Amino acid sequence: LQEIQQAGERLRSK
Amino acid sequence: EELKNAEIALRTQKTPPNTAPADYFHTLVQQFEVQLQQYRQQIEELENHLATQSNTLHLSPQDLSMAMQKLYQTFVALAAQLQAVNENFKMLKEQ
């Protein structure tokens, strides 16, 4: 899930 | 997009019968400038989601709770944004 992957990325970046 | 391009092309043709190509090349530079970083960001995210699916084996239930709390905070500040936009547009329609 690319939005889930982006949100996990946002977890990783924030 | 192609159709509009061809129509303007026909107009320019009926007009004809080096700065522009260099400018178009530089624009082709600018277009991809950000897209390379889009690729890099999507790649770092691919590595991240791959690492997470490696954990997707079982894991502990709490992360969902963390995401739910951040979800309520997100929707709250988003209601702040939306309520702000609504109230300002209502002040406008009043004016």
UniProtKB/Swiss-Prot annotation, chain A:
Location(s), subcellular: Nucleus membrane; Nucleus, Nuclear pore complex
Role according to the record: Plays a role in the nuclear pore complex (NPC) assembly and/or maintenance.
Protein family membership: Belongs to the nucleoporin interacting component (NIC) family.
Protein name per its UniProtKB record: Nuclear pore complex protein Nup93
Native source organism of the sequence: Xenopus laevis (African clawed frog)
Entire protein: shown range: 33 to 46 of 820
